[PDB]
């Protein structure tokens, strides 16, 4: 199936890879691009797996994988957009092929060659590593035994959505471990499903409130109350000590003495970059942020770039970073595709992210957003803007229930001005003052 040589080889078939393939085809007409994906699915976007796909009025949404934004599919393109790998060398004006169900297990940088899990070898001229990451798991779950492990979900892929959606219709109690984006969005989604069926949803995490690492405490606490009003039993300040099976149910023991009985656990406790290929490829990994260490142009070696969740890159403006946003995979993937066709451009356009936690909670963010940084919040906590500061300069912004204003927030961070009155800057977001 796979040819012996391809001009453009993209390792991994996710958001960053697809954005790169589209970018290469737009900058190099007739280009021949091969995506190698270990998943059986064609490239698709993940955000709907924790949001729109759970709020669809169509009960066949699990099969169609379409959602209302305007209806559209979770796949970036239908199969008709792609050509087969076997035909990729011969088709006139080239195309984009995806070799599904295949994993790159060896990378030879000196010879511009990869080896697949089935023994196949492919040489390339330009290569992109866009392997993303794998969900982390709790140490308490790893030591819990096979039964507990079989009743614990790591949420990332289409299969995880389908398996958890089926569970929410079969069991009475689901527990989410994790207070970040994924845990909070799944809590609101499972909470909506539970209100109609009369079932239970629990979310526990060690922080004082949802999104405690991202939002200031006062806004994290406000968010926790909104999640609770979606039908979720939220347990902050919860550290899992052990997990076992008791009378057929899962028993979660917390360090503080509390105990939670439930039927199924969803672990949403972060992501580990997929850097397996750094060993054979002799590629540098970043010990501080994780991931493949690349420069401002997302380049690792002469013919190898890295994009997406797995790329630790140099931001000429904000310093060295690694970002795990959908839009960042798109932006970095497209940038890598342009540099794979001679652009030599540095990461410059700042990617944004967003989150929706029910009807009354939606926010957008950009730049360095971290609750450890000093923050200034200007609210009208219905609507407002939170500025994240470093050396008296705005390095990140969170827009709370403010939409269609991201270009303004992007300009403020790019300009790097020293603002003496952030209340005037809040007027740019139609806000007419909390500190942390
Ligand atoms: C449920 C969910 C909801 C999200 N919601 C949001 C949101 O609302 N807003 C937001 O900004 N971000 C969101 N994100 C984050 C966003 O989806 C990620 O930042 C984005 O998918 C990262 O793109 P990627 O290409 O770097 O990685 P991935 O999408 O993970 O793609 C990597 C692909 O490469 C495959 N692969 C790995 N190693 C190999 C190998 N050796 N050989 C072959 N294939 C390999 C992996 O199987 C995977 O298929 C969400 C993520 C999830 C999981
Ligand atoms: C930056 C970001 C934003 C989100 N809304 C998000 C949601 C998820 F479910 C998982 C990861 C996420 N990462």
Numbering used by the authors: 127 to 195, 199 to 509, 560 to 611, 616 to 619
Can I see the authors' text?
A 60-kDa FAD-dependent oxidoreductase, AIF allosterically switches between two distinct redox states. NADH binding by the oxidized AIF monomer reduces its FAD cofactor at a centralized active site, allosterically disrupting hydrogen bond networks to release a 50-residue surface loop (C-loop) and stimulate dimerization at the AIF surface. Oxidized NAD+ and reduced FADH– form a long-lived charge-transfer complex (CTC), which stabilizes and maintains the reduced dimeric state of AIF. NADH-activated AIF dimers support import of OXPHOS subunits by CHCHD4 and are critical for mitochondrial function.
Crystal structures of the W196A mutant bound to CX1 fragments and the underlying 4-aminoquinoline (4AQ) scaffold revealed that these scaffolds localize to the NADH active site, mirroring the native NADH ligand, as do CX1 and CX2 scaffolds bound to the wild-type protein. To accommodate this amine interaction, the aromatic side chain of F482 must rotate out of the binding site. Crystallographic complexes of CX1 and CX2 fragments with AIF(W196A) (C12, D3 and D1) or wild-type AIF (C9, C11 and D7) reveal stabilizing active site contacts and sources of steric interference that correlate with AIF dimerization rates. By contrast, methyl substitution at position 3 (fragments C9 and C11) and methoxy substitution at position 6 (fragment D7) slow allosteric transition.
